[PDB]
Amino acid sequence: VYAWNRKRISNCVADYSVLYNSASFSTFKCYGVSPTKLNDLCFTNVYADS
Amino acid sequence: PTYGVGYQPYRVVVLSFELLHAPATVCGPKKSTNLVKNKCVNFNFNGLT
Amino acid sequence: ALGKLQDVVNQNAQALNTLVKQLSSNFGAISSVLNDILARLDKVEAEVQ
């Protein structure tokens, strides 16, 4: 966690339901967006920190 | 593995989204449709609804 | 000499051009644009914004 890894996502298309339908996740707290609503949207860039 | 459920390790991922006053490069799965002109229409251009 | 009449035009322009600029203020909401909130949040979340 002191040196977290970031993946850039760009020039691409997604389906966030493949994530939000999964029971595998113990938490899925979205801020400034609804998870169900993500499939209506587009973004300049997305960053996936881990 | 003897640690309690709060003391155990968790994997964490943070999806960060940005939509500037600049064109999109990532989108959801929704399929496009034909353009219509001079009629009154509801629209969604890249999340500009 | 007609400053009295042009002042009446100026004050109504200053009033309306302030009333219209206040549409762009957030007041602590996620966006000044009502269609962003309705494109991004579900009913129970969006009504609070």
Side-chain angles (χ1 to χ4, degrees), chain A:
Chain A
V1 68
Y2 81 92
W4 47 270
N5 289 171
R6 165 169 288 181
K7 178 74 188 195
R8 176 182 169 75
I9 313 296
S10 72
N11 315 85
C12 186
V13 293
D15 176 3
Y16 299 92
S17 75
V18 173
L19 312 182
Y20 70 66
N21 291 337
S22 188
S24 62
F25 303 118
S26 309
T27 277
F28 211 102
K29 287 284 173 184
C30 301
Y31 297 88
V33 211
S34 160
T36 71
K37 196 69 79 184
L38 289 168
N39 279 356
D40 295 353
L41 295 170
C42 295
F43 310 108
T44 309
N45 306 294
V46 184
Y47 310 89
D49 309 345
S50 58

Side-chain angles (χ1 to χ4, degrees), chain C residues 2-18:
Chain C
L2 289 82
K4 287 185 179 184
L5 303 186
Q6 185 61 54
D7 182 10
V8 173
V9 177
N10 292 353
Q11 288 179 46
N12 286 279
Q14 289 160 12
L16 288 167
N17 299 353
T18 303

Side-chain angles (χ1 to χ4, degrees), chain B residues 6-44:
Chain B
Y7 297 83
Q8 284 171 25
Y10 288 64
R11 281 172 186 224
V12 177
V13 175
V14 183
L15 301 175
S16 312
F17 307 121
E18 78 188 340
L19 181 65
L20 307 181
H21 305 288
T25 81
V26 182
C27 287
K30 277 187 164 175
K31 293 179 181 178
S32 56
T33 197
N34 289 298
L35 181 64
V36 175
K37 298 173 184 166
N38 305 312
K39 296 193 186 187
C40 179
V41 293
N42 160 243
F43 60 72
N44 179 348

Side-chain angles (χ1 to χ4, degrees), chain C:
Chain C
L2 289 82
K4 287 185 179 184
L5 303 186
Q6 185 61 54
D7 182 10
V8 173
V9 177
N10 292 353
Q11 288 179 46
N12 286 279
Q14 289 160 12
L16 288 167
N17 299 353
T18 303
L19 180 71
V20 172
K21 284 176 191 185
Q22 286 288 64
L23 290 167
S24 75
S25 300
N26 286 59
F27 309 104
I30 270 166
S31 181
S32 59
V33 178
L34 185 68
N35 288 313
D36 294 350
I37 290 163
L38 295 172
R40 286 168 56 178
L41 295 172
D42 299 352
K43 296 200 299 178
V44 173
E45 302 169 308
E47 287 181 16
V48 183
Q49 296 296 313

